[PDB]
Structures are given as structure tokens and as C-alpha cells.
Amino acid sequence: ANPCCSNPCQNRGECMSTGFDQYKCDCTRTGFYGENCTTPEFLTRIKLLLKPTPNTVHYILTHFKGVWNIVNNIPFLRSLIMKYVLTSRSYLIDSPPTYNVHYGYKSWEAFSNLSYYTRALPPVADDCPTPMGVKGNKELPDSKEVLEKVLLRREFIPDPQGSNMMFAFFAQHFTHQFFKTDHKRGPGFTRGLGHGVDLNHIYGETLDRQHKLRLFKDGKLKYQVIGGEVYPPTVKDTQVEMIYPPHIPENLQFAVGQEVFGLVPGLMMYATIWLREHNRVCDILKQEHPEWGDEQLFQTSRLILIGETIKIVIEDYVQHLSGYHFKLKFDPELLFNQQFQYQNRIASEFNTLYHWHPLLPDTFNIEDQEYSFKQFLYNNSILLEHGLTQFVESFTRQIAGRVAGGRNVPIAVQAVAKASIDQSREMKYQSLNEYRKRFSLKPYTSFEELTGEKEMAAELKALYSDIDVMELYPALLVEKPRPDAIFGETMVELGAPFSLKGLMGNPICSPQYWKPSTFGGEVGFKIINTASIQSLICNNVKGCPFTSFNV
Amino acid sequence: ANPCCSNPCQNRGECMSTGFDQYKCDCTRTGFYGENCTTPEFLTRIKLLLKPTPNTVHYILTHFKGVWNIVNNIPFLRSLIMKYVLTSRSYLIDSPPTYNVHYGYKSWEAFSNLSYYTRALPPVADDCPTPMGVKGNKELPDSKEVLEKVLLRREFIPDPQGSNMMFAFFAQHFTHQFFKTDHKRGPGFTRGLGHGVDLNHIYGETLDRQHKLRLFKDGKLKYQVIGGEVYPPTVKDTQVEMIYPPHIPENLQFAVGQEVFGLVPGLMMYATIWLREHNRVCDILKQEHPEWGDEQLFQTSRLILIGETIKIVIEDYVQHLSGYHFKLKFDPELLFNQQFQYQNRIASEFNTLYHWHPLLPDTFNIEDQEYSFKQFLYNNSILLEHGLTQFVESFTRQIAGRVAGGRNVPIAVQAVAKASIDQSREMKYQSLNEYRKRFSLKPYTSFEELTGEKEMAAELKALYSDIDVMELYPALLVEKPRPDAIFGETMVELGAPFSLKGLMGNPICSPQYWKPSTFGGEVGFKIINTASIQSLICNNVKGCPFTSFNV
Ligand code: HEM
Ligand code: HEM
Numbered sequence A, B: 001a002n003p004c005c006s007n008p009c010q011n012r013g014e015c016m017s018t019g020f021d022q023y024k025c026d027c028t029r030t031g032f033y034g035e036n037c038t039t040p041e042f043l044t045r046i047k048l049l050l051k052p053t054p055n056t057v058h059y060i061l062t063h064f065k066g067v068w069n070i071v072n073n074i075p076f077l078r079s080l081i082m083k084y085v086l087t088s089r090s091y092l093i094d095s096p097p098t099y100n101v102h103y104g105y106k107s108w109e110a111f112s113n114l115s116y117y118t119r120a121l122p123p124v125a126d127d128c129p130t131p132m133g134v135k136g137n138k139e140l141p142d143s144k145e146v147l148e149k150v151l152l153r154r155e156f157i158p159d160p161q162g163s164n165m166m167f168a169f170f171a172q173h174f175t176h177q178f179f180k181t182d183h184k185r186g187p188g189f190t191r192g193l194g195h196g197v198d199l200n201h202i203y204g205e206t207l208d209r210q211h212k213l214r215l216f217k218d219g220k221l222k223y224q225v226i227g228g229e230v231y232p233p234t235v236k237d238t239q240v241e242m243i244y245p246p247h248i249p250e251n252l253q254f255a256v257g258q259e260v261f262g263l264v265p266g267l268m269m270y271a272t273i274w275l276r277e278h279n280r281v282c283d284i285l286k287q288e289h290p291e292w293g294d295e296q297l298f299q300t301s302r303l304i305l306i307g308e309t310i311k312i313v314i315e316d317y318v319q320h321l322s323g324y325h326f327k328l329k330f331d332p333e334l335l336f337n338q339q340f341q342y343q344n345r346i347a348s349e350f351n352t353l354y355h356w357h358p359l360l361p362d363t364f365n366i367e368d369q370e371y372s373f374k375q376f377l378y379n380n381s382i383l384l385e386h387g388l389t390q391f392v393e394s395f396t397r398q399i400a401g402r403v404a405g406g407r408n409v410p411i412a413v414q415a416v417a418k419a420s421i422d423q424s425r426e427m428k429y430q431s432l433n434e435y436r437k438r439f440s441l442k443p444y445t446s447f448e449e450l451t452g453e454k455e456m457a458a459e460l461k462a463l464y465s466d467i468d469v470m471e472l473y474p475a476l477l478v479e480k481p482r483p484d485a486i487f488g489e490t491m492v493e494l495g496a497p498f499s500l501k502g503l504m505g506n507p508i509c510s511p512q513y514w515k516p517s518t519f520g521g522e523v524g525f526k527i528i529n530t531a532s533i534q535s536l537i538c539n540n541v542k543g544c545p546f547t548s549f550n551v
């Protein structure tokens, strides 16, 4: 019955009911005007016919290697171009945040309640005739059929960008500090009240957990020594609650910041590495400041590790994902002379698009062993068996799977994928093309255009009938990938602004924070500004083994 | 023992211990360099000799009535100058926030923990030899002696700006939504987790309280009718927790958003007025949107009332306080093309400086009655006796007291004033001159310069011995006022930036919020943009009595 069910307002204009059968669109500062905000202004037209498509920019950034080879060696040009790149991802995310799963309109409840995931697009109203609004049938196609037809992996499809398990597990570990759904409340709620990179997955969400994890000497975290190697402490030793099956021995119940990192040895690997890094930084700082107490050492170390995290994510992780020849640079100073809100609210769609389970292989190859999913899950005895060095050397060698392209979701976690669909419907997500229009992307006019392929497109056309009823998540998983790339256009163009707000929106990137004294002086600052995955592993793993995000 | 005890770093440079007996100043982006950041740059020198003093600007804004009479009638000039005024209060407050009572250095605990008041200046370290750092004696002078010698009121000193009781109670009411100290935790802690103007003192801090206060019909708040007049509901009807003496009858235990507003009839007056305003706006919106449900009506009404509150605060409240001939304007669009952080964390010093208890008269004069403090406190039967109309008519006539100039704190609240001293020392506040330097003000070289008077200055010199040991709050209360004004320089130049961050930092002032559709269309937007204390009283108080913030 709601006259806004068809999402009539275009170009981010806001829809408002003006009666039972009438609507009005607020076209304030959209650059457009008219009934549904479709008539462009002069400056709008000018900026329109002069704006390059994301595929053109991507092509430019993945080609002309010599030009970028010259650019990367000129600090001025590199800084300028990096500033342009940062700018291109700005002004796409509502900050301060607006809607959530319970509010299709702006309200103080939606703004103040930090328990909600925020929403890039408002949910479809409950009284709408169809799940997507007014288009499509009364019900969306069977999620099981979608899953089995176009999502489930027949044969392992390797990532053409050469991503490995170091990358996959880094992605899981890193994202699971702000993607922490409160299943007690619902899919649209989060337990990560920090809504960003606070390293709560290392230090704990609450203060009591943090204290239980701390040694309260030299700023360090508690740890145990097995076979001369440093590992996280146990649940029995710290009373830190962790999620483990009842058949897991006490000496194998490692306790870390995030309570679910006992699930995968790959997660416990990075947990251990980051623990060791925190204590290392504590040693360095203690040597620099012998007059410092435990608390200051701990806090400063935490800030430093946050810095390292953002640094590595930008210049290694995203650098690998992008396939750019241009070297991305982590430098907050590039945003000081521009408008930028230093705050962030984790979006539900950001969570949804980051379900990169196709990265997972059928088996996990460590040294000379091939473990199944059943054998690998909740098995830290594997980590103790092979050790951190062998784990790094093995995960560096094993290639991960392609995320986009379709049919590469491992069967072992099929129930997860289906959930990603079901919950998406439960949270009343708008359609794919709506989210593309939301991020200034051209809507798909057919399923073949979406897939760049005829078979899966035919299946999807049989299931959804209309392209404007296609859902976001499976579209993300079956989308035509960029040339020999892991992702398609939608994944990148949606994930990048969210990532920008989630990284550069961190308070340590603010002018009053971004200075040496914040991190204990020039030494800590240098620890941040010289951070890399290779340096992390080299400094914290025995023998300094070679590591990378690609095979 | 801490080498930073003497506060060596000048011009907002940051001090860091580099050993047990050495320190270093981070002068990053301060405009200065050298050991303690005292050596200015060329551009810094240029900006320094061209910057007018706050007293000069105050003079220019409080004189030349004809010129300003011309300015206020030209939208362009008024917008320009208002933009300048807004800009002059920017770049003073740390946003995102930094320090608090327990952290004199930046840390994630200080940033993320919302239970803290933030701090404009870091606290004096615990191991410092003197309360202020290194200057002064081992202990600050007796707070009772300071109180009795320069703070306590002898004869009532009226405000030369003619501020009335409507103004005073509006001040208390408005400020007590973000000034809510958690005395269970300590004076450095707050219960206002929203840290700003969320109107929690009307709608309740939490969701349960709000839901208890709501009618869940037409978006309205619950209310009762007494003698034909609308008043807030009872504790018996809503089960809302309020603070009342044990002898207060159940039919007099009114339930409002803030648990302490029943202790002062002046507060209950405004609580009633704002309740009525909310329900009125609910009626208007319901007429505009017959298709809307209870929840959206409620939320939209809330946002609108926030708007009205900020509007009234800027164009009537602060307009009266300033004494400017220039007409201040509430317009978020003035900041849309400038760097501004739409977030706010309430500072402890902001709380301290806003203790304007000298505003209180010896008696409260209503119609033909003069109530003492003992008679006026916890007595809402007075409000029911005279009614809202007579209350407004009386409080409009009765003049309030001067805040600066010394010796005007009423004896009935001496215990409060003393606390303001004691707790200030408990939270380890830095000295008056440190806070003056922090906000780009010239340090006082004597107590006579501070007071502009010989007697109180002599007493203060006998007490503190050194002017650099003078505390912030009593200095605020005894400071030489501006010519025929209520405040001194420090009060204004410290209070104004805090207020800027507290008013324009509100999310409804952000470009994605500041639009008609946020407030249910052009009608609600007009309600916000045409709000005033006069219209607020006229719309909701019977007879539409004339009101103002001055006599
Ligand atoms: C052995 C490897 C993995 C397993 C067994 C696994 C399994 C799961 C499970 C069971 C969930 C929770 C489903 C639910 O709560 O409804 C989940 C959620 C998720 N997984 Fe994976 N996953 C793995 C690796 C990864 C990887 C490599 C990524 C890549 C970034 C990833 C991203 C996510 C995300 C974003 C969520 C949503 C979690 C939340 O909102 O709290 N996972 N995974
Ligand atoms: C009408 C009579 C008033 C009384 C009886 C009164 C009394 C008090 C009391 C008892 C406190 C708490 C002090 C403590 O717990 O240590 C207090 C706090 C305060 N008062 Fe007043 N006050 C009055 C009016 C005002 C006015 C007009 C203002 C200024 C607008 C004001 C501003 C404050 C502030 C800012 C606080 C601290 C709030 C907090 O931290 O929770 N009060 N007042």
C-alpha cells in the first residue's frame, strides 16, 4: 500500500509518502530535480559526460605498467593520484549513518542505537506487495534451488589473481572484528559496538575480557610456551570464554580476543602472530620508555597495532586484491585538506558482500597433509603439530578459489551460503540493480549481461524471471569477473567505499591523532609506517619465512 | 617525577616522557617548533599579528548598532558574517576526542569508552609534586575559604544584561540532558551516553524508559489533565523511575525523561512545555500524514523538536547571552563547504564552567508570592497552584543574578559550589592560565587583572600566592566581566567552542539529514526554521503570554 514501494526516487533522492496513494521526492543536493529526481542540472550534466566508468578506471589502473612504474617512484605524483583514488570513493557513504533494518526513514533510534548494522539502502517496507517492492512474483525463488544451481561448487575454480590461504585467512580474521552478528537479536544486529578496526578480536570487546587477557606486566598479553613456541593462553588459565565443542581438551582451548577464533586453525594462526606482535611492540616501547607503566605500554601498543593493521590492509591486502600497478599508499595526511568524517558505522550490506567463502579450498594442505573440513575445524592440535612456520609456508603455497564467476561455494559450508540468502530476504534487502544505482553503477539489462555467460544466466532467468528482481548476494557470487580477476564490478564498487570509511575513518587517522607522540614517539610511528605482512611474519614467526597474499 | 609535570610544551604541542628525567614536545601542525614549541613559523607570525583579540571582536559585535542593523537585513552579509563567527569557534575542540580523567595520553580506552567525560586538557599526573604540576604549595588552599571569601553571595547582584528566570531555568533544563554525572562512578563520568542534544531529558536515556513514557498512539507522549491543563504523567501510571523525597504524594510524582526534573518546579515547567510541543508537532504531522503510523510520527516529532531546541538555543538563548547587535543565525548549510566533524563528546570542563548557580535569586517570585529555596524545591504543587501561564509571566519579570564578578553564589547552594571546587581537584584540573593558553587567551599576570578589582584579588593572592596556581572554576566565577555583561572573557572563549560542537555537531545538521524529508516535509522543516522561545511558549501555554530571555 506504501506509495514508495516501487523506489521511484532516483539519484539518491529521498522518497516520502504524502497520503495513502501519493509520494514526493526530496531532491536536495542530489544534482537532480523533478518528480522522481531524474532531470539533471547543468553542472550535473557536465560532471556526467566527463565521468569515466569504473571499468575504464580499472583498466587504466591495471594497464600501462611502465607509466605506473614512473609514477610510483615520484612521491608527489603518487600522493596526488592516491588522493584522487581516495576522493573517488568518498561521498558515497552516509556519514553520520541513517537507516537500518527497522527504519526505512531517518530517526534518532537508527542513529543512536549502536547495536544495529546500518544500511546503505533502506529496507523494503513490510506492506509492499512483493519482496523487492512492486516487481517480481509474490515470493522470491527457492533459495535452495538458487544455491544448488548457480552457487555450489562442482569443481574447484582457482583464483586467477593467485590469492592464497594467507590472504583468505587474513580476510576472515581481519573482517571478523567488525562483522560479529548478534544472532540472539537478529541478522541486522552486531556485537561489535566499535563499528570498525579496534582490534577487539585481539583485545576483547569488553574491558573485563581485556583484563583477563592481559598480563599486567610491561603492557603485554598473557601467553603460554609450548615446545619453546609462544601461543595464546588457555580458557582454564584466564577464565576467558571461548566457543569450543565439549570434546576439545583444556590444553587445546586457546583464549583470544574474538570468541570464535577457535573455529579455524587459520584464525588461531593470525591470532598467535598478532599476540606475538603486541608483545614485541611492548618490548620495543619498554626499551624506549623505561619510565612507562604497564597501562601506557599496553594502550600505545594497541594503537600501534591498529596502525599496522590499516597499513597492511591498504598496501598489501587491497594492493593484491586490486591488481593495480599503481602502488596504493596509507597516508592520513592526504585527507587533512579535504572534507572527511572521521567516524564509521558498519553496514549490513558490507557484511553480506564480504561472505567470500568461495575462497575456501576443498581440503587444507599443510606440509604433506591434506585435511578435510571435518578434520580441520576446531583442531588447534594441527597448529601445535606443524607449527607457525610450517603453517605460513603451507598457506603461502596453497591457492584460494575464485569468488565471482559462479558455482564455487564449497559444499561443506552450503548451509552458510543459503543463510546468506535467507537472512538477506529476512532483512528485506532491495534488488541488485537498486544497489548498483545507489553506487552510481549502470543497472543490468539481462542475466547474460550479469554473468557474461549463457547457462547460469538461463537458470537465473528461469528462477527470477526479471533482472530487476535479482538479489544482491548471489549476483555478487555469479557476476562476470573482471578480466582474470577474482571479483566483478559490483563487489568492488560497493566494498571499496565501505572499506574507505572503515579504514581512514579510524580516529588514529585524524589530524590530532596522526602524530609520533600518539604512538610513543618516532619509533612506534615508524613501526606503523613500515608495516607489512612480510614484516609481521618475519618479526613474529621463527626463521622469518617468506609469505605473501599470492602464490 | 614525571618530566611533563611542568606542562613545558606550549601552543598545544604534546609532551612525552623520553626517560625518567627527560621529555620531548611534539609540535606537529602547531605552527611552532623548538624544544617546547615556542618558536613560530613565518606564516604563524603573519597569522599572529593579524589576529584580533576576543575583546576586540566582542567590542565590534557589541557596538555600531546601525551598521549591524544594515547587516541583519542583508541575507548575503548576514550569512557571510555568521559563517565567519562559526569558523572562529572551529579548530579548537579535539574531534574525535582524546583525553579523560584517567588518561593524560591518547589511548583506545579513552576514545571508545562513552561513560567518560572527555577532557580539553589532560589531567595533572599523579606523581607530580604539586596539585597544579610543579608550581604552588604542596596543597591548594582550603576550598571552604575560597568559597566564603570570593564566591558566597553577600548582597544579590543582578545581571546587567537583564537575564530572567525563564532564561536561567531554560539553561538548567537544556544543559541537564548532556550534563548528567554518574556519581556512582565518579565526577569524571557521565550518564549522557549520547553526549549532546538528543532530548533524552524528554524522551528518556534508554528505550525502555522511552516506551514507558510513550502513549503509542499518534506518536504522542503520555500525559494527564489537571484542572483542564496538560501535565506530564505520574510515576504510578508509567512506572518510570524518578527522584523524589519520601514525603511527595503519588499524584505529584510527575514522570519525565530526566529523573531529577521533579526537584525544581522551574524544570517541570519546561518539561511540561516541551511535552505539549511534542504532542502538538505530532498533531501537525498526523494531519500532514494520515497514512503514517505511531512510530514514525514519534521519531519525526523527536527530530523536529531537536531542531527547534538548537534553533532556539542559537537565535534566542545565545543571542541574549552574547549581547551582539548582529543577529545570529541557525543554518547548517553554512558549514557544508567547510571541514567540520559532525560528532561530539561532552567535556568535563564544559560541565564545570556551566555551573551558573549565581543566576539563582534569593527567592523565587511567582505572581504575588516569594518562595524560599526550602519552599520552592521538590514542590510541584506550586506549579499546579499558579499554572504555566502565571509561571511564565512571573519568571519573565524576575531578574536573574550576575555570574561573573565574584560573590554572587547563593548560600542555599554553597555545598554545590564547594563541590565544584573539590571535584575539580579530584579530577586533577590544570590551572586557569593553562586553560587560557589552551584556548588562545593571554595568561593573567596578576589577580587584579583577573578580577579588575583590589579586594577579592587581595584575598585570592593571600590564598593562592601565585596567579599560575589559580583554579579554573572560581576564576570563572570571580573574573572581571565584560562591560555591563554577565560573563568574563574565559567563560565565553571556553564555552563557545564547546557549544559549537554540541549544537552544530548534531547529526541533524549534516547534509544527509538537513533536508525537508527528514522532518516529514516542508511543514516540519518550517516548524524548525521558524522556532523561537516566544513561539514555543505561545503555542503551548494558555493565553499565549509574552515571554523573553530578558526583563
Ligand atoms: C574454514 C573457513 C570458514 C568457515 C568454516 C566459515 C564458516 C562460517 C560460518 C559458520 C559463518 C556463520 C554463519 C552464520 O552465523 O549464520 C560464517 C560467517 C562469515 N564468514 Fe565465514 N567461514 C570461513 C571462512 C571465511 C572466510 C575466508 C571469509 C572471508 C572473508 C569469511 C567471511 C565470513 C563472513 C563475513 C561471515 C559473516 C559473519 C558475521 O556476520 O558475524 N569466512 N562463516
Ligand atoms: C534552580 C535551582 C538549582 C539548584 C537547586 C541546583 C542544584 C544543583 C545541584 C544540587 C547540583 C549537583 C551538584 C553535585 O552533585 O555536586 C547541580 C548541578 C548542576 N547545576 Fe545546578 N541547580 C540549580 C539551577 C541550576 C542552573 C540555573 C544551572 C545553570 C544553567 C545549573 C547548572 C548546574 C550544572 C551544570 C550542574 C552539574 C550537572 C551534573 O554534572 O550532573 N543549575 N545543581
Ligand SMILES: [C]OC(=O)[C]C1=C([C])N(C(=O)C234[B@@]56[B@@]78[B@]9%10[C@@]2%11B92%12B7%109B857B925B673B%11%1254)C2=[C][C]=C(O[C])[C]=C21
Binding pocket: A058, A085, A086, A089, A314, A318, A321, A322, A323, A328, A487, A491, A492, A495, A496, A497, A499, A500, A503
Ligand atoms: C572489499 O573491497 C575490496 O574488494 C578491496 C578494494 C578496495 C578497498 N579498493 C579500493 O579502491 C581502495 B579502498 B582502500 B585503498 C584503495 B584506496 B583506500 B580505499 B581507497 B579505496 B582505494 C579496491 C580497488 C580495486 C579492487 O579490485 C579491482 C579492489 C579494491
Ligand SMILES: [C]OC(=O)[C]C1=C([C])N(C(=O)C234[B@@]56[B@@]78[B@]9%10[C@@]2%11B92%12B7%109B857B925B673B%11%1254)C2=[C][C]=C(O[C])[C]=C21
Binding pocket: B058, B085, B086, B089, B314, B318, B321, B322, B323, B328, B487, B491, B492, B494, B495, B496, B497, B499, B500, B503
Ligand atoms: C556557554 O557558551 C556561551 O557563553 C554561549 C556563546 C556562544 C555559543 N557563543 C558563540 O560565539 C557561538 B559558537 B556556536 B553558537 C554562538 B553561534 B554558534 B558558534 B556561533 B559561535 B556563535 C558566544 C559568543 C559570545 C558570548 O558572550 C559574549 C557567548 C557565546
Ligand SMILES: *[C@@H]1O[C@H](CO)[C@@H](O[C@@H]2O[C@H](CO)[C@@H](O)[C@H](O)[C@H]2NC(C)=O)[C@H](O)[C@H]1NC(C)=O
Binding pocket: A113, A114, A115, A116, A184, A185, A186, B206, B207, B208
Ligand atoms: C537497540 O534496539 C534493540 C531492538 O529494538 C533493543 O533491543 C530490545 O530491547 C528491549 C528492551 O528495551 C527488549 O524487550 C527487546 O526484546 C530487544 N530486542 C532485540 C531485537 O534485542 C536495544 O535495547 C536497543 N539498544 C539501546 C541501547 O537502546
Ligand SMILES: *[C@@H]1O[C@H](CO)[C@@H](O[C@@H]2O[C@H](CO)[C@@H](O)[C@H](O)[C@H]2NC(C)=O)[C@H](O)[C@H]1NC(C)=O
Binding pocket: A206, A207, A208, B113, B114, B115, B116, B184, B185, B186
Ligand atoms: C569505562 O571505564 C570504566 C572505568 O574504568 C569502566 O568501569 C569499570 O569497570 C570495571 C569492570 O571491568 C569495574 O571493576 C570498575 O569498578 C568500573 N569502574 C568504574 C569507576 O566504573 C567501564 O566498564 C568502561 N566501559 C566500557 C564500555 O568499557
Ligand SMILES: CCCCCCCCO[C@@H]1O[C@H](CO)[C@@H](O)[C@H](O)[C@H]1O
Binding pocket: A052, A055, A056, A059, A060, A483
Ligand atoms: C577516457 C577513455 C579511456 C578509455 C581507455 C580504455 C577503457 C576500455 O575499458 C574497457 O571497459 C570494458 C567495459 O566492459 C571492459 O570490458 C574492458 O575490459 C575494458 O578494456
Ligand SMILES: CCCCCCCCO[C@@H]1O[C@H](CO)[C@@H](O)[C@H](O)[C@H]1O
Binding pocket: B148, B149, B152, B153, B154, B455, B456, B459
Ligand atoms: C557571605 C557570608 C560568609 C562570608 C564571611 C566569611 C568570610 C569572610 O570574608 C571576608 O568578607 C569580607 C566582607 O565581605 C570581605 O571584605 C573580605 O574581603 C573577606 O575576606
Ligand SMILES: *[C@@H]1O[C@H](CO)[C@@H](O)[C@H](O)[C@H]1NC(C)=O
Binding pocket: A006, A007, A008, A035, A036
Ligand atoms: C517517474 O516520473 C514519471 C513522470 O515524471 C512518472 O510517470 C513515473 O511514474 C515516475 N516513476 C515512478 C516509479 O512512479
Ligand SMILES: *[C@@H]1O[C@H](CO)[C@@H](O)[C@H](O)[C@H]1NC(C)=O
Binding pocket: A374, A375, A376, A379, A381, A382, A385
Ligand atoms: C585433529 O588433527 C589431528 C592431527 O594433528 C588428527 O590426528 C585428528 O584426527 C584431528 N581431529 C579430528 C576430530 O579429526
Ligand SMILES: *[C@@H]1O[C@H](CO)[C@@H](O)[C@H](O)[C@H]1NC(C)=O
Binding pocket: B006, B007, B008, B035, B036
Ligand atoms: C622551554 O624551553 C626553554 C629553552 O628551550 C627552556 O629553558 C625551558 O626550561 C623550557 N620550559 C620548561 C617548562 O622547561
Ligand SMILES: *[C@@H]1O[C@H](CO)[C@@H](O)[C@H](O)[C@H]1NC(C)=O
Binding pocket: B374, B375, B376, B379, B381, B382, B385
Ligand atoms: C509547597 O508550596 C505550597 C504552596 O503552593 C505551600 O503551601 C507548601 O507549604 C509548600 N511545601 C513546603 C514543604 O514548603
